[PDB]
Amino acid sequence: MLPGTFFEVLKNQGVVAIATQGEDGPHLVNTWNSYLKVLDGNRIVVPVGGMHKTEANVARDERVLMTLGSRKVAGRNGPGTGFLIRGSAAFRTDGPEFEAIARFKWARAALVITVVSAEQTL
Amino acid sequence: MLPGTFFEVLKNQGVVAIATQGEDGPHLVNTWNSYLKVLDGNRIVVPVGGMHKTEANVARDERVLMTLGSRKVAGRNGPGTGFLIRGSAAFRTDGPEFEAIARFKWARAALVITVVSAEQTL
Ligand SMILES: Cc1cc2nc3c(=O)[nH]c(=O)nc-3n(C[C@H](O)[C@H](O)[C@H](O)COP(=O)(O)O)c2cc1C
Ligand SMILES: Cc1cc2nc3c(=O)[nH]c(=O)nc-3n(C[C@H](O)[C@H](O)[C@H](O)COP(=O)(O)O)c2cc1C
Ligand SMILES: [Cl-]
């Protein structure tokens, strides 16, 4: 699901954005490109410190959107690229998906996104 | 209302994320930190090339969320910071707000976000 160009983006610094559906509208939170931990089976894991509203939204609708990119990776027509990722989210407080990000001692949980599509949008 | 730290973030490159309300969950698109043009009266202007789905969503619900940040600007507790912006969106195709981003020759419109709140979230 995730292409080589996406892993090239992860070699670079940047702000990741994660959109969820709440009752009254969307919500949008962040992590860092360098915090994402990618596992076998199309999983992207995010260390969770806050994300309380995000977690409440995921209870309502597990489908999330994620974007990220880097000016330092070539897109189709010039320097810079990024991705729109769609997948389903789950929060883990133990087990190997949590252990994947447990080095971040501030993390109360792991946000595990199982990717269904990844589109290079530039 | 946009604070000095937000302008410091804009001096550095990054991926901006813009969330809208779709008919079956959120939608999420991007621009670059360096593409934003900030005008008086709390207006952030984004050059629009694509964003057809985003635009359709805004026509139904003008409320948007925007995030952006930079590893290179100090947050409250370490290097790196970013912002959650909440505001209302409009798409302009003539006049001063369109002219503000018209140097981008690929632009079909200007996405004008009138900021209601800005939160430094790190
Ligand atoms: C650049 C950036 C990186 C962030 N990294 C994380 C992170 O890795 N984990 C996290 O829980 N919150 C992180 N935050 C804060 C979240 O975006 C969010 O504000 C916080 O978790 C509260 O989430 P909620 O609004 O869903 O309750 C980061 C914020 C910024 C601006
Ligand atoms: C880092 C990055 C920057 C982008 N900059 C713009 C931009 O300035 N204007 C634009 O219309 N689309 C830009 N795009 C593409 C949009 O994110 C989006 O994929 C495209 O406009 C289609 O929008 P829609 O899904 O609302 O139809 C950028 C994409 C990335 C990854
Ligand atoms: Cl990073």
Helices (H), ranges, B1-122: 4-10, 52-60, 96-99
Cβ distance B117 to B2 under 8 Å? no
Phi and psi at A33, nearest 5°, equal: -50, -45
Q: In chain A, how many domains are there?
A: 1
CA–CA separation, B46 and B62 (whole Å) = 15
Cβ distance B9 to B33 under 8 Å? yes
Q: Which of A28, A73, A117 to mutate: most B Cβ within 10 Å? A: A28
- Classify residue B11 as left (phi > 0), alpha (psi -120 to 50) or beta: alpha
Write the CATH number for A17. Answer: 2.30.110.10
DSSP A47-90: EESS-HHHHHHHHH--EEEEEEEEEEEE-SSSEEEEEEEEEEEE
Cβ distance B33 to B14 under 8 Å? yes
Q: Which of A28, A71, A84 sits opposite B84 (nearest CB)?
A: A28
Check CB contact of B113 with chain A, cutoff 8 Å.
Answer: no
Experimental method: X-ray
Our measurement of the distance from residue A23's CA atom to the centroid of its chain's CA atoms, rounded to an integer in Å, reads: 22
C-alpha distance from A71 to closest chain B C-alpha (Å): 7
Look at B19 and A32 and tell me if their CB atoms are within 8 Å.
no
Q: Which residues pair with A90 in a beta bridge?
A: A112
Buried b (16+ CB within 10 A) or exposed e, A32-64: bbeebbeeeebbbbbbbeebeebbebbeebebb
CA–CA separation, A38 and A65 (whole Å) = 16
Owning domain of residue B48: 1-122
- Cα-Cα-Cα-Cα torsion A31, B55, A119, B71, nearest 10 degrees, comes to -30
